Amino acid sequence: GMNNNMSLQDAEWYWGDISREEVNEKLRDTADGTFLVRDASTKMHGDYTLTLRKGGNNKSIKIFHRDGKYGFSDSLTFNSVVELINHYRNESLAQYNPKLDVKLLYPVSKY
């Protein structure tokens, strides 16, 4: 069973550029529970940062562009453009808690 696993383009929204068309429009059309990494400009707000709605409000776990850095906003500087997008925590019930959880079921596929 020779299975050659090229493990990127895994996340459903993944252009490199999804802003307003999902951040504002799927906030209104699917309500709450929707994973989407948002391409804002550098002097504006979160420049390709992780955004989702989770029981009403916005649970944004990465902050700003900063290379693309996995874990939390402290002293690391850099990591990836797949660990930040979807790896155990960034597209799962395991984002907050896998047994308790809230709302996270509608990732916006190529939009």
Side-chain angles (χ1 to χ4, degrees):
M2 291 180 88
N3 63 100
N4 53 254
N5 296 302
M6 288 71 182
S7 183
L8 242 176
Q9 197 187 251
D10 310 292
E12 315 325 285
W13 72 80
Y14 192 74
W15 290 34
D17 188 8
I18 49 124
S19 50
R20 198 173 179 176
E21 278 292 20
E22 68 301 289
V23 176
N24 298 94
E25 200 66 67
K26 283 288 192 181
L27 172 150
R28 190 196 73 78
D29 288 89
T30 197
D32 61 15
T34 189
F35 288 105
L36 48 93
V37 181
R38 63 110 81 183
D39 194 68
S41 294
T42 310
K43 192 180 286 183
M44 189 285 183
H45 191 249
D47 175 40
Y48 207 63
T49 212
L50 195 307
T51 39
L52 70 134
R53 285 190 72 188
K54 227 197 95 279
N57 226 91
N58 317 281
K59 182 68 180 183
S60 186
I61 49 279
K62 199 205 192 297
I63 300 164
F64 207 58
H65 80 100
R66 195 183 172 184
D67 308 293
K69 36 57 71 180
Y70 183 68
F72 73 110
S73 72
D74 189 88
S75 186
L76 80 166
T77 66
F78 68 85
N79 189 257
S80 187
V81 293
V82 66
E83 283 62 46
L84 290 303
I85 321 302
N86 70 141
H87 177 266
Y88 190 84
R89 194 278 185 101
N90 288 303
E91 189 183 337
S92 188
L93 291 67
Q95 194 273 276
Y96 182 79
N97 210 264
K99 71 200 80 180
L100 199 165
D101 76 72
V102 188
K103 295 263 66 174
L104 54 278
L105 68 170
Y106 309 116
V108 185
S109 71
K110 301 302 183 82
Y111 180 64

